[PDB]
Amino acid sequence: TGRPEWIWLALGTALMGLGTLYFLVKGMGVSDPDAKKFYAITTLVPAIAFTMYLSMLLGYGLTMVPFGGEQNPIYWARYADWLFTTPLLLLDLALLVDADQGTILALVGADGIMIGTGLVGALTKVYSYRFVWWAISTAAMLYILYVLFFGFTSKAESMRPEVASTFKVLRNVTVVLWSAYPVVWLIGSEGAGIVPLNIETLLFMVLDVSAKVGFGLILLRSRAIFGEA
Amino acid sequence: TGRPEWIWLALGTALMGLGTLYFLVKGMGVSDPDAKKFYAITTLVPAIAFTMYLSMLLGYGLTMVPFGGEQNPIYWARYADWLFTTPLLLLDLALLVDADQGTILALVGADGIMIGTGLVGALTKVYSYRFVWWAISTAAMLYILYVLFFGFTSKAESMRPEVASTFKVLRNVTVVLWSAYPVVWLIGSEGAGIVPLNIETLLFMVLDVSAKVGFGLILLRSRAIFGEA
Amino acid sequence: TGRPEWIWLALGTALMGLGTLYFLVKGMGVSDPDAKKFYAITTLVPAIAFTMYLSMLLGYGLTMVPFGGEQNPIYWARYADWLFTTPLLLLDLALLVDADQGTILALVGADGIMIGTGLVGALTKVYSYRFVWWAISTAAMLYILYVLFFGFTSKAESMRPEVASTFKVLRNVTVVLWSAYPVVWLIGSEGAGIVPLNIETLLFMVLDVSAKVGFGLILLRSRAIFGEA
Ligand SMILES: *C\C=C(C)/C=C/C=C(C)/C=C/C1=C(C)CCCC1(C)C
Ligand SMILES: *C\C=C(C)/C=C/C=C(C)/C=C/C1=C(C)CCCC1(C)C
Ligand SMILES: *C\C=C(C)/C=C/C=C(C)/C=C/C1=C(C)CCCC1(C)C
Numbered sequence: 050t051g052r053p054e055w056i057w058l059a060l061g062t063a064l065m066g067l068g069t070l071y072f073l074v075k076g077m078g079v080s081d082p083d084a085k086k087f088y089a090i091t092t093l094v095p096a097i098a099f100t101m102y103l104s105m106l107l108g109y110g111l112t113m114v115p116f117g118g119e120q121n122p123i124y125w126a127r128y129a130d131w132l133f134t135t136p137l138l139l140l141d142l143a144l145l146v147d148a149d150q151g152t153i154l155a156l157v158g159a160d161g162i163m164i165g166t167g168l169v170g171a172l173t174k175v176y177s178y179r180f181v182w183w184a185i186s187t188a189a190m191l192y193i194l195y196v197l198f199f200g201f202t203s204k205a206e207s208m209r210p211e212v213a214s215t216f217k218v219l220r221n222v223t224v225v226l227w228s229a230y231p232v233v234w235l236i237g238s239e240g241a242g243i244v245p246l247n248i249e250t251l252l253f254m255v256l257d258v259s260a261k262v263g264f265g266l267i268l269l270r271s272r273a274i275f276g277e278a
Numbered sequence: 279t280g281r282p283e284w285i286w287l288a289l290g291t292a293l294m295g296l297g298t299l300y301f302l303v304k305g306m307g308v309s310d311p312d313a314k315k316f317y318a319i320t321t322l323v324p325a326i327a328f329t330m331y332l333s334m335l336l337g338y339g340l341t342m343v344p345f346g347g348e349q350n351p352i353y354w355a356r357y358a359d360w361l362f363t364t365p366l367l368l369l370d371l372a373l374l375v376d377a378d379q380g381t382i383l384a385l386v387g388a389d390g391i392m393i394g395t396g397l398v399g400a401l402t403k404v405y406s407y408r409f410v411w412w413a414i415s416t417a418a419m420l421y422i423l424y425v426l427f428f429g430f431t432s433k434a435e436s437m438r439p440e441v442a443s444t445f446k447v448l449r450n451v452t453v454v455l456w457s458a459y460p461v462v463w464l465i466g467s468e469g470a471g472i473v474p475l476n477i478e479t480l481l482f483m484v485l486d487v488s489a490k491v492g493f494g495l496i497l498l499r500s501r502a503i504f505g506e507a
Numbered sequence: 508t509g510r511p512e513w514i515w516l517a518l519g520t521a522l523m524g525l526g527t528l529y530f531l532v533k534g535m536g537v538s539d540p541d542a543k544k545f546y547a548i549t550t551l552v553p554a555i556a557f558t559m560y561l562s563m564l565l566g567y568g569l570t571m572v573p574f575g576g577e578q579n580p581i582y583w584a585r586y587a588d589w590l591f592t593t594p595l596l597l598l599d600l601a602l603l604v605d606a607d608q609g610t611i612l613a614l615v616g617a618d619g620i621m622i623g624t625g626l627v628g629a630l631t632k633v634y635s636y637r638f639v640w641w642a643i644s645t646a647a648m649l650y651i652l653y654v655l656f657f658g659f660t661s662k663a664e665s666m667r668p669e670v671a672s673t674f675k676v677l678r679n680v681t682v683v684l685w686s687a688y689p690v691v692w693l694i695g696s697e698g699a700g701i702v703p704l705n706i707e708t709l710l711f712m713v714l715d716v717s718a719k720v721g722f723g724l725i726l727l728r729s730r731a732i733f734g735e736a
Pocket of ligand 1: 227
């Protein structure tokens with residue numbers, strides 16, 4: 050209770066936890082080998098996020114970086130959460146549109162750089178260099194969104210009509226959800242510094258619960274998975 | 279020779295090393311594409327364990343964590359060893375019962391959390407929080423054992439009779455081997471503190487050599503691999 | 508500009524960057540599902556290397572290790588670069604010769620140990636132990652080269668004649684490129700100390716640009732990829 054933002058981490062931790070339990074219950078009873086894959090990916094994301102927000106809650110996922118003339122606290126576990134949950138989400142979009150292996154490796158590789166670089170910028174002690182990694186990270190995001198908004202839209206339209214319009218929904222969601230992250234980072238205390246830490250923790254918590262529980266609720270509640278029967 | 283438990287790490291290092299050489303020799307001459315997979319998984323485990331026990335032996339895989347009112351030394355490499363060797367073992371059980379892709383990702387993901395959380399608890403400076411991560415880690419173990427003792431038992435019985443009864447043996451082994459770890463951790467100096475460090479290093483070495491050399495001796499010496507010929 | 512070797516890291520960073528852009532442009536327009544895989548692997552390598560050399564350039568990928576009686580600076584990001592780019596290259600050789608899954612896991616697992624151990628030796632504070640990990644790492648290299656120079660040569664000769672002679676070229680390249688690394692490490696300031704740091708940074712930069720841009724230029728400019736048409 051020593052931090053003026055533990056409520057957001059506490060709320061997030063609970064939201065990830067209960068979100069994992071629902072996917073556990075709702076995921077029990079699935080026999081379709083193609084559907085069980087989507088339920089394995091989607092349930093593990095909040096499982097990861099729950100362990101990550103509990104570490105930030107207890108203070109383990111927190112460290113100090115001397116930049117900007119202050120000892121700004123950096124929730125590194127936040128980026129670690131993203132490092133693990135983003136590639137799983139990309140795997141949901143891939144398996145839905147039945148993307149070839151090549152395309153999948155590119156998106157995953159670009160995603161790791163986006164999170165890898167992003168974390169460097171967040172730990173960079175030189176204030177000016179922080180945004181250099183931000184520019185790199187953000188560019189890596191635009192590539193991922195490019196193949197998602199343009200590469201998979203055609204393949205999905207050529208896929209089943211159950212998964213065609215279903216991908217269009219998650220596409221628009223992904224375009225706007227991912228875009229919010231570099232924005233919140235930039236205005237946050239880690240980037241420009243216009244928004245204080247506690248509000249930064251809140252906006253990022255909202256994005257996380259949306260992109261780790263909400264997003265999952267759209268997929269699993271859609272018959273675009275399973276088999277044609 | 280400055281530590282009263284280097285003998286256990288030294289003995290372990292040798293046992294992992296010689297265990298890797300046997301699997302190297304015995305694994306030479308395998309042409310079956312399905313059998314070579316099992317020999318690649320099973321041989322790399324002690325290869326990893328050997329490098330990990332040598333680091334603890336030389337002192338590289340060791341660090342101090344201020345918890346419980348003492349500077350308790352924590353062999354982090356121990357958990358890193360588990361982080362790398364457990365998913366390979368799970369891959370042996372998977373390929374033997376021919377488990378679908380979905381099931382494999384769940385077990386691997388749960389396994390990473392079990393080891394990930396477990397390591398946090400081992401590095402936690404707040405003594406009370408150490409067991410919170412223990413509870414999480416142990417729960418993650420029960421899930422893995424649940425799908426192994428119940429999920430794969432039916433699929434194995436429906437698989438070949440060579441691999442059916444063969445999985446039943448490794449199943450009983452896995453149930454009891456994995457269970458011993460959270461127990462040794464809890465009574466060890468990292469958890470409750472009833473057992474001193476050096477005896478903790480011993481019990482964990484026994485488990486490691488069993489679960490990284492012994493376990494491998496049961497699989498490779500079983501015709502449940504190879505092809506039906 | 509505070510380091511007498513930033514020119515080599517700066518030059519490397521630019522060479523990785525522009526190398527990534529060419530593979531981006533040249534990789535645009537590929538529709539063959541088998542060819543897109545090779546273009547995804549080969550383009551991500553310098554993408555990784557570019558982010559890694561920029562971190563060493565800005566100083567982020569640098570740390571001090573007290574060994575040999577001095578505070579020798581260790582570019583850990585250098586090894587991290589190798590940790591990520593080597594398995595991708597091995598995947599190029601694998602997919603070209605259509606190596607079975609088993610063989611691929613062995614090479615990747617051995618590769619991780621080679622880089623994993625190598626990094627330990629580079630961070631080892633005891634000077635004598637540094638070469639113990641070197642011996643282990645180098646041995647792990649000889650295994651990788653053994654399966655490449657002997658294991659895949661027969662399979663490639665039995666593969667397409669487009670990919671048969673093409674693998675023979677990359678084979679001879681790989682044998683000599685990989686061999687140079689443990690040599691440069693040994694004579695460098697991290698090993699024996701015969702060569703100063705700045706020249707060490709240069710020889711390793713040359714190897715990196717060759718093995719991350721040059722090597723990629725040989726594969727993508729070869730019709731051994733694509734489909735038989
Ligand atoms: C938690 C779920 C998702 C989809 C999270 C996505 C996060 C990002 C795309 C974050 C990207 C970053 C950028 C582009 C630049 C600053 C560093 C960030 C990691 C925040
Ligand atoms: C070395 C081979 C195997 C199979 C090792 C398995 C280790 C575990 C299942 C350990 C689990 C832990 C738990 C459940 C709680 C405390 C932290 C541990 C990592 C020891
Ligand atoms: C950047 C591209 C490639 C192929 C790099 C390969 C690097 C190695 C094979 C390095 C091996 C090492 C050995 C064998 C011993 C000292 C530590 C090293 C990592 C340099």
